[PDB]
Structures are given as C-alpha cells and as structure tokens.
Symmetry: D2
Subunit: 400 residues, 4 copies
Amino acid sequence: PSLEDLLFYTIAEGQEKIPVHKFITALKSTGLRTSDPRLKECMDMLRLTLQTVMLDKDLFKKCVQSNIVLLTQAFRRKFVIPDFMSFTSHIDELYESAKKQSGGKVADYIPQLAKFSPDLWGVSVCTVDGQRHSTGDTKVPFCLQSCVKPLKYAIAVNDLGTEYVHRYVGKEPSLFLNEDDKPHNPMVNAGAIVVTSLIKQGVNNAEKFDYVMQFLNKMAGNEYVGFSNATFQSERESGDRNFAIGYYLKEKKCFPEGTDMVGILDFYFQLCSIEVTCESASVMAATLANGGFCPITGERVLSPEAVRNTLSLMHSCGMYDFSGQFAFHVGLPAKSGVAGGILLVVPNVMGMMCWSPPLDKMGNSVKGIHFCHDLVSLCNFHNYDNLRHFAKKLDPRREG
Amino acid sequence: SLEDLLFYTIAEGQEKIPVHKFITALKSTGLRTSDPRLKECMDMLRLTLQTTSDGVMLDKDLFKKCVQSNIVLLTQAFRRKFVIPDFMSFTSHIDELYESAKKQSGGKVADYIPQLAKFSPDLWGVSVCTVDGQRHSTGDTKVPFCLQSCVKPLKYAIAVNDLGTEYVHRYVGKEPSGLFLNEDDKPHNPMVNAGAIVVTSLIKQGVNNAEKFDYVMQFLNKMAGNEYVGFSNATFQSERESGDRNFAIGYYLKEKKCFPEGTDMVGILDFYFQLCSIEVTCESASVMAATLANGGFCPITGERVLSPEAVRNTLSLMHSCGMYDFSGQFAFHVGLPAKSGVAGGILLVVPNVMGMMCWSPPLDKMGNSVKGIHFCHDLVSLCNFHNYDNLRHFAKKLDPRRE
Amino acid sequence: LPSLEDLLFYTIAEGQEKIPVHKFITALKSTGLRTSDPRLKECMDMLRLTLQVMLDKDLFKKCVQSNIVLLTQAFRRKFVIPDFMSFTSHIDELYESAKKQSGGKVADYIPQLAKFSPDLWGVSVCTVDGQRHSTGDTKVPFCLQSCVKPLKYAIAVNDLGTEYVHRYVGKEPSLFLNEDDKPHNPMVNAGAIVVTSLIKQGVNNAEKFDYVMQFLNKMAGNEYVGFSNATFQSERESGDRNFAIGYYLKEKKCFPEGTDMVGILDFYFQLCSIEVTCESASVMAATLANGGFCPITGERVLSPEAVRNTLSLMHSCGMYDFSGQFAFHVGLPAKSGVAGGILLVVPNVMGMMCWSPPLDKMGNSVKGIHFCHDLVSLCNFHNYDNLRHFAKKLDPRREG
Amino acid sequence: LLPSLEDLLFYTIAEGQEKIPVHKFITALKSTGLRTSDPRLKECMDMLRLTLQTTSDGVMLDKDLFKKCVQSNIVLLTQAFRRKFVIPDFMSFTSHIDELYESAKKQSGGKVADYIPQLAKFSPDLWGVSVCTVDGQRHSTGDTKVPFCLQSCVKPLKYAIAVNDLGTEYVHRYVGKEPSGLFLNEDDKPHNPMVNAGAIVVTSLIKQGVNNAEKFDYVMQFLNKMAGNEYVGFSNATFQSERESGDRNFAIGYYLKEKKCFPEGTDMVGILDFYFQLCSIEVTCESASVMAATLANGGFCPITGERVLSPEAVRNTLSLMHSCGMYDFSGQFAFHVGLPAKSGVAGGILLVVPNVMGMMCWSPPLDKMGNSVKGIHFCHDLVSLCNFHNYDNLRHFAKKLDPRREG
Ligand SMILES: N[C@@H](CCC(=O)O)C(=O)O
Ligand SMILES: N[C@@H](CCC(=O)O)C(=O)O
Ligand SMILES: N[C@@H](CCC(=O)O)C(=O)O
Ligand SMILES: N[C@@H](CCC(=O)O)C(=O)O
C-alpha cells in the first residue's frame, strides 16, 4: 500500500533484494541522470549504504523515500516521453543524418569563431520532465552570440512586464526602425541592444553582468555557464555595426532616460560572449519549454508571461532571414547564432541545443537546420500538427 | 456490455430511464440531438416512441436497442472523455465573454458595397464547435453573411489538398509581407488579395467557372458538416462592379506571369469575386473552423475533408498573415490562427480544441471586427489557448480541457 | 538710306555686276537653311517665276525683298551657329564614331519594333534659326513611343496651366505613387496616362487624336507626322502593364471626374504609335529649344511656361533609370523612346533627333547615348558649362 | 590704333570738358557696380591716392593725369564704362533686388535652428542678400556683414575641391552623382555629396595623409581664394557644440566604416572632427556671394581674376546643387526656380546663376524642410521677375525681364 513499497515490488521483479546496479540501470532508462538535482537525497543515501550492494525492501525505502514522487513518475511511465530509449535512438539517427551535411562556412569575422572546427556537431535534449540525451560534441563550450537574445528578453519581461518592455521595442517581424520609432523586435541587433539597456538599471556593468549570469544559471539548472573575454574583446574591437546602431538609437531617443549608450554596448558584447555547452543550453531551452520552470531543479525561474512572449518572438523572428520559412516548414520557436548554436523549443515537450559551426548564407547552422527539418518530418512536434490525426509520423508522447 | 454499462450510469440505480432524462443528459455533453453521428440513435428513439407501450420509458433492453449503433460516441460523451469535459461551465464562460464584447460599440460597417453597408452594427454572434462536435452559440448565430476574405484559408486549403505544398508555393509565398510582390516575384502569401487571386487560379484547372465553383462549394459543404453554405449573387455583382483594385492586381499578375499556363485572368477574377460572395452563418462556419482544429476531419460527420499537410499549412498562414496589418500584434497577444473578413467575420481555430466564428459588422481602422478582436483578447486572457501558453503551468488561466 | 536688298546683292555679287542663280542657292545652303524652308517660300516662288539664269540688282531685289530680313541674318552670319559647315562636319564625325558602337538589343515586345534593322542610325539637327543638317537614316518613319510624353505634357500645360496639370501629376524623379497619391512625374508611364486624361476633355477619342496631331504638325513645322495602326493594335493587345496602371489609377481616383479610363488607355496607345522621321522630330525639339516658337515657320506653338516645365522634367526624368547619370554627364534635357528615339534639346541652340533601334539595358539607344556623351565632350553645350571659360571644348556659337 | 584706349575713355567721361573732377570719375565707376576697393582696380586707386597728394589742382585730372591713373587697369575700366559687363544697367537691377528683398522681409515664418545654442542665438529678423556678378559687380541689402556658419553650404565647396584635386572619376568611386529619392545606393556608395553621409565621404577624400590642422588650412586657403580674400573664418564655439551633439553623424560614420566606404587607411573618427570643423566655418553674405560667383564663372574669381577651381569641378558641383541642393525641396526647387543652390541650417542659401552672378541669402528662420523661408521666397520671386531660370529661353520669355539685355 506504501508508495515506496509499490515501487519496490515493481522494480524487485519478485526477488527479495534489488542489486544497486539493477536500480541504477532502470532509473537511467527513464532518461533521468543520476546527477539530477532532484535526486540528490536518494543518491546521497545510496552513497551512505555503499560505504558499509543488495538492497532489501527496508533499505531501499530508506534510500528512495525523499524522492519517491519523482521516481514513481519515472517508473510508472508518466514522463512526457514514456519510451525515452526509443526516442533517443531516433535522435541518434537524425544526428547522424545531419552529420553528413558538410556544407557551410564557419564565421570568420572574429578569430575566436573562425578557430572552431567544421566537424564539431552536437545535439542535446532536455525534456520538460528532465529526461536527458546527447550525441556528438555536447560538452565543448561555445558562445551564445544571438542565441542570448530570447533569454535576456525573458529576463527583462520577467522583471518589468510586457508593457514596460514593449514601450521600447516592438513585437512584430520586420538598422532602420518601425512605424513608432522602436526597433522592430528584440530578436534583431537594434532591439536586443534596447533590451540590453532595460536590464537592471542604476547599477554598474559588473553588477548587471553578475545578475544575468545568476539568472542564466537558474535556467540551466546550475550547469555550465561561462564567459569568453577573448570573444568579448574582439567583438568590441570590431563592432562598427553595433556602434552605428547605438549612436542611431541615441539620436532617435530609443533608450530609457539616463542611459550611457557606450556602456550598454559594452554590456551587450559581454552578453554575446557568454558560453554554454549543448547540454547546459538544452536545459535553458527546456525551461522555456516548461513554462518557466527549470525541469531539473524544479525552480520557477521565469514568469509565464516572460516565457510566452519569448516563444512568440522566437517563432516569427528567430532565425534571421529564414524566420518565415522556418516557421512555415519547422514550426517550432527557435533562435540561432553565429557560432552555429540553435536553441530550440518544443513547447510542453523539450528543449534542445544543436551546435555546428558552419553556416548557410542566411546565417544559420547548416546541420542544425537540416536536423530541425528532419525532426519535424519524423515527429508531430510542428505547431500546427494535430494531436489526434497526424498523418504518417510518430508521436513520442504516446507509448506506441 | 458497453451499452449495459452506459445504461446503469444513466439510470442511477433505477430500472427505467425516462427518455427526456437521457436527452437532457446527452445535451449537456454539448452534443446536439441533430448530430449526423447520433442519427441511428435518434431514429430508433423516434421509432420506439411510436411503438412503445409506456409513456416514455426505456428499460435496459430498450435503451440497448436505441443506443447500440452509436455506443462508442455516446460512451465518450458520457464518460467525459471529450476535449472539454465540463462543457456547461465552458459555455457559461463564453456567454460572459460575449456579453462583455457586446458593450464594445466601436467601429464602422463596411460600405464599399451596398450589401455590406446594410448590416446593423448591433449584430453580434459567436459559435463554438469542438473537435468532438460539442456545440454552443450566443447571439446572432443563424444569420447569413459573406465569408469575404475568410474564404482565403479555405480555398488555400483546397488547393494544397489537391495539388500539394510544392506546386502551390511555386506560385505564392509563405511569409507575412513587408500592390507589390516578394523578391521571387510571387505574391507574398495566400492571405493577401494578390496571393488569393493566384490561389484561385490554381484550383480545378481546365473546367469552366460553374464547375469550379460547384467543386469549391461541395468541399465547403463537407467542411461545414453539411450545414449552411450559400451564395450571394447580390454581393457578387457588387464586388465585380467595383473591384478596380483586384482588376489592377490581376493585370499586374498577368504582366509578371504569376499565373499557370493557359489561365484566363479575367475569368479567374470572376471566380474570385464569387468565392468572396459565399455565405455562411456563425454556426456553420464554426464547423469549418473545427475541421481545421481537428486535423482535417469534420468533427460532426467524422469525415476526412482536408489532408494534414493542407490543414497545417493553412494554420501557419492564418497565424502570421491572417488579420491584415494587425496580424503581428494578434499573433503576439492572442496566439491563435485566425482569418478576418470585411463583413465582420473572424474565423478562429484553437488547434486540438475547437473552431469558432465570430460576427459583428463594425470594423476598426485595420480591416477587423471590433467585438471579434475584443472577444479574442478576452478569450486568451481567460483560458490559456495561446499557442505558447504552457499546458502544465499557467499563471492563473483556466484550462477547459483539465476539469 | 541705301537699300537692304542692295546691300545683300553687292556682298553676294563680289563686284561682278550680276549673280547667277546657282551661286545664290549655294551661298544660301552654306548658311544651313534649306531652300524649302517655309519662311523662304515667297523668295523661292519668285525664283521659280523669273526662272522662266543671271540676276541683276533689280531682279534680285524682286526675288528677295519679301524675305530680306531672314536672308540678311543668314548671310551676315548672325545665326546661332555662324560657321554651320564646320559644325556639320563635326556632327558627321560624331555620327561616325557612334556608328561603330554596334552593342544593344532591339526591342521585341511587339513585332513592329522587332522588325527594324540594328544598323539604322540617323541624326538630325535643327537650329533655333532653322539651320538644318542630317546624317544617316533620317527620313525613315519610326514611332515616338515615350518620346511623345514631353510633347503631350507640353500640350496639357499650354492649354491648362501649370497649376491644373500638377494637381494630377507630380514634378519630381522617383505602378506606385508619390506621397500625395499623384504619379511621380509626366515622364513615367503612370503620369503619362494621367496627362493623357487631361487633354481636350469632353470630346470623343477621334477628336482628341486630331487635336494632338494638329499640335504636333505645328511643332514640327509641318514636316512628317504619321500614325502606325499596326503599332497601335499590338500595343493595345499586350499592354497588361498599362491596364494594371490604369485600374490602379482609377481605384486611387487619380483621373479628373468623368474620365473613361479604358478609353484613355486607348488614346494613350495611339499617342505612342505616332510616327516621325529624325528630320521632323528635330524640328519638334527645336520648338522646345526655341522657347515654343517653331524655328522654321516662326509660329508660336507652345507657351514659355509649357516649354520650361517640359525641359525641366526632361532634364531629371527623361532617360529612365539612366536619367540621373545623364543629367550629370550630358546635362541636356532629353527624352528616350523604346523604338530607339532620343529627342534632344540644347536650349537656345538646337533640337535633335537621334535614332537607332538597339537599346541598352536601361532601354535607351546605345548609339544615341554614345553620340550624346560625345557631343557634350566636344562642345560646351552641357547645362552647367560656362559660356566664358571652358577648357578644350569647342563652342560653335562663336566664330573662332 | 590712332587714338589710344586711355584717351578714348578720357573723352567719354570728360564730356568735352578739358578736365575730369575726381568725384565724377569715382561716381561713374561705382554705378557700374564695381567697388573702388576692387582688387583688380588697385593700381588705379593707388595712383589716385598718390596724385591726390602731389598736386596743385585739388581734385582735377587733365588728360595726361587721368591716363597715368588709369593706364594699368584700362581694359577693365573700358569694359565697365562702355557697358560691356554681364549686367550693363546694374543700377536698375539693384533697384529690382531691393524690391525683392523688401518683399521677402515681410515673410515672417519659420523657426530658428535650436539644436545647438550658437544657431539658436541668431535673431529671427536678420535678413541679408548679396550679389556678386561674374564681372565683380557687387550689391547688398540687409544684414550682409554679419557672420554665420556655412553649415551644409560648405558641402558643394568641399566637393569642388575634391574634384579639382582628384577628378570626377576618383571622387565618384566613393560617392554617387544622383538624388537619393540614412541609406546607401545600389553600389553601397552614399547617394551624392550633398547629403551628410556623402559629405563625410567627400571630407575623407581631401588632402589625405596629413593631419587635420593641415587639411583645415588647406581648405581655408581655397575658400579664401574663392571669396577673393574676403571674410572667411571660424566658429570654435559652433564646432564644439556640433561635436558634442552629432550622434546622427557618429551613427553615419560608424555605418560608413562598416560598409568600407572610405579610402584605405582612413581614421573615421578624425574624419568626423574635420567634417564638423568645416560646418563651423564662417562667412558673411558679401564674402559667400563672391564664392558663389566663382562657381558662376567657370571657376575664376570675378574680383581677383584668379583661377580657383577646374571647369570640371565647377560643372559637377553645379549639377549636384541643381538636383540635390535644398534637401527634400530639391525637386520642387529645381522645377520652380531652376537654379543651382545649397542651403544650410543657419539660414544660408548659396545661389548661382550660371554666367551671371552669385548670391548669398541669409535669414535664420527655417521652414520644415530646413530652408530659410525668406531665402525660398526671394528665390521664387527672383525667377518670376527674370529670365534666369534654367530652362527659361534667352530669346523668348513671355513677361520677364532680362538684366543681360541692354533693354
Ligand atoms: N555578435 C553579433 C551577433 C552574432 C550573432 O548574430 O549570433 C552582434 O552582436 O551583432
Ligand atoms: N472581396 C473583397 C474581400 C474583402 C476582405 O474581406 O478583406 C476584396 O477582394 O477586397
Ligand atoms: N509604349 C510603352 C513604352 C514605350 C517606350 O518606352 O518608349 C509603354 O507604355 O509601356
Ligand atoms: N550639422 C549638420 C549640418 C547642418 C546643415 O544641414 O546645414 C550636419 O552636419 O548634419
């Protein structure tokens, strides 16, 4: 009748004792990792009883009681994708298939970007329940670049609301400005720079940057977030483009009262030069997918308003000149950047990061784009893809 | 024993369910008794009402005979397995919203042709059709009016059905625009007039206008589950008198070679004005919308009408280009695929949930119905049908699916 | 006191007591006048009479007295170019030099245009004093096409004033419309179509076309003007472009009240189909050069307001997309046509028609353009050349 | 050959009198429209000063005395006196200028530029007009001796210098020759030197490889010559204010730098500095009119006789003033006035009538196109009065007056 007992019997298979490796394996095949923040108590307990292999009903109950709800959900098959092994097999195929696509040029406008190999290709999945999978180069760091644009937009809306933010920037797809003399949307450079000015006003750059990093940490569930000073230096050295825009926004009175624009550009470049991995960035995406809750910590990180707005803008303006085409064919909110990241959200299902340095003339990762098309081909995930009556296509949220 | 199970749950330990009781129970699911799918059942009840010894009473074997043919659907309806289980509560909310948008007396009625100018400003209707056929209506929901540009996604859908994404999008774009053309010399997308005219040319090539029109009308009949779909000659004549704009567009498309080989552009414009002049009611156009929300299956007839590719493409374009120059703002704030029309229609799809139509004739400075727009804003604020609302977490929205 | 006829006799005589006719005819020709000049008709009629060979003072005086003023001007070297023989030698060189330029393509959108040989090339000059010269294929009818646009604009302004005309059409360089929903300028097709609707309102098409033809006669001092029905028929069959514009103009209410726009388009295609030689069109251009007086009849044809406005719009909008470049390097008011016409005006000096059928990709005659640039290199005709100081440039107005 | 040029002139002035009184000669000379202080006349005026000291007959020149005074300058003096200048009846023409000036005076519209304090300081009521003929005949009315900044009035001048020194072909690699119709044209060149973006590129072309101080001096000397050594100067105060608040131009500079619009090895921020210095150069109506008259005279300066700009330079500059010279009123202006003209935000309009004269019009209130209201009114009136329009006919002008015509 006890929860721990019920779970014990199901895992036990009628034996009297569960070998520790039998439970770990079973757990792993739900897609959870053993380093999941929410499973810390259980793993700490296992570490304890290991200092003294076989777990009886009472010893097991002692290890798992703190995390029984989550563990049951996993073992009952209540996660958003129940057959995660099958799903990861499919992800592996899509990865392999995109790997073959050798087209594209690596971004060479600064050394740091130009230094990355064309053969680097990673894909990471984090489910809204925290199920995690990776193939390829998922642990290498690289800079978010423009991929940071939704995240800081999220932050601004989180902190200030829709109304205040949208006083300063628009919300529709397109250096030039909209009808009302706002930049068109936070997904372009002009709008991003305006969004940059909004965040934590009245404290210095160092402080502001620390705030954004803490927030990024929560979104990633305390996985890898870093900073590239080198990238930062080269960006500031060579951003005549963004200097143009700043002076223009200044002239046109685009910033909030008492903005030091040159200082905001400096912040803006530091923001571009933040580093993630596939793995960490997928958690961030999963946060967006999960409604502002981090799927691995369980923390509320972003308001429902922040997340909805962000996904809306990722939809229509997220992939530079390919936005509209991407919305039509792929139908997922996403954002890319010049180091080859695409950050992809499949609302209520998962967050994804894809990384490959060579880009197409639109500015997007070749393999990343190829991968996203393939995903949507295979899976009902398109925004306007019916839940009942897909045509020929898989639904991973259905047992099979 | 499926029929037996349902009998015990309806009876409430009694031994004879009185007919009116079953009907009332059935209704509050949201189905209407006139549902195509429920026909065998209703026919049997009528039969036994005649032949019966009792006033009106059905014992187990009698109930079984009436419901057996339609048991699957009746079990879903009664086990609360439909998309919106607490339909009564949902319709109460719809009614509050309707009332609240009623007060919004703003706008002007289109007057560029007499037929449009005739409509009273105080006409206001809303109708709902679920992907399970649960129906509801408030206001002026049985009044015919013309689809106008509401017909644009419907005919686009037909074209993609018959021809495929690839063929169709040779001749027309798939992105919200910047009357002119895109960098590839295609009209920007089917939702604008230039691209609608091109889509019109794609449909049922090589047969006369009369045949083409019948083809489209039949298709519309199926989408609407054979509810009202009509023609307005009066509207049509007036459209063709005064479409110098569309004549402009046609001649420009002809110059730039945007039509298929052997298109007669003037005849195509005629077909176009006819398409615009098609009449619906709120009630029947909600079923049309629900076909689009139900993946191409008509939720009342259960009939496959449009391919999944067609339906998906049409919703993508209603998302981004459906509300003229308000499109962007609508996509952001409402987040629902929708098409507006100059008569005051707003065709609304909430994918996997329901279809609606909304009618009031005063329009704002953009082409769109004031009460419709206000209703849609209100609906989203209430209920978490926003495309990028979370299913599992939402602020204090309401989830009609959940209970 | 001593007669004017007497004076001219002795100058031509050269102390010989009698002048033969042929000598006077040759003398007259070398001023650049033609013996068929309208203003010299009395004198030619007299010669025809008495020529039923040698002319004494008294006989001469009888022949020339009626036209003594114009003859004394010619002979006493008071015409705009005085060494006209030298000038024509230079025209001939320029004509040859532009000859060799065989580039370009002949327009082919209607059969009638596509027929013309690429090797046709004519250049006609008419001076404001009526001095004429020609090289090449100068007596071959072709259609003015858009070369008719300045002419009919001239007619409209003549008849209606600047203020009326410009209510309907704009006055600046660029189916779309200016800020105020007027077409940009009478030189583009949209504006030309509006200018067409302005002329002789309240009468049927046949009457309007007769009126325009009469006006064109006067402008050309009764030299060749004709109509190509064939051109007209083809134009009308295939002007989907102009049907587009007309419907658009109708929608935007660009025409005066009670215009039948379809009939206006009809007239518009008739105007485009009007036929000139180089010779006749050069006179037309000289009318514009000479302030609205026809230099060969001395008749006032257009008002100074008509002519000024027309030259202004020629300057800036006369050569399609090439216009700007043309104004800058050539600096002469000119209108080009799809048939290879370039109508060229050198204010206060002369009119020209250049014709060759191959066009460049701006739609302008290759050789016409090559010849126009050459003319300006040679002579201080450019609009912003200085009359007093100019570098190596020749100036035919001066005697040398 | 028999009677001598100086002698002939003597009889024409003297009028059968054996002697010409000085004041008579001076008065006659002035009414040609020359100023006694004309550079070309300096020998004559020096001699008169001499003889006015060295003589018995206080004020009276005989034949021999007159000859000694005028002999050095006799050509230009015969031109003046024998009515061979471009406007022969200058005194009638100035009467006409006066009436137009008075009429423009009455126009009280406009707003004074306030984007910097130095501009905003100028009184609305200031209004001047200066005329300089291509023969050096001068006239002024109104506030002609007050200084003000050229602002964008400097743009054709520095363009002229660039083309003089480098040629059409070099210059137009970096800049367009057509009205725009901020943005770049099809070829990623600014549209034309008359817009700010194009002006900033023109600025970079001039005296490359030297420091700003040298460059500035080089432009100044050039301006001095165009003005016949009349006032040109500088407002450091204006310059400081420009550089503090030119976010617009910094925006442009950064954009031009990104799109590689400058010559190889350009320091763009230093270029901007030099640009603002140019905008801050000062003239008066009188001095700037001589500048304009240079341009109306195929690049010689009418008062010095000195060749200043190449013919090519001047022509190109007049072409661009025609089509792009009056911001967004350029097309209307070209149609209605038909003169090459440049305006500036201080209220200047620099106006050229080819082959006839140069003008400078100044009043500080601007209309919402940014041009001096009184300037614009004056220019329209000038055209309506006389046959100066571009495409006005020299022989047939319906009712209009022609200054060149002996009348
Ligand atoms: N660092 C670039 C953005 C690179 C990107 O688009 O990813 C910028 O700030 O403009
Ligand atoms: N038939 C109308 C449709 C108007 C509308 O619904 O926007 C047209 O083409 O203008
Ligand atoms: N008739 C042609 C233009 C002829 C020309 O360009 O000269 C048209 O209206 O399009
Ligand atoms: N200071 C302004 C120029 C003023 C003017 O237009 O005259 C600028 O450099 O843009």
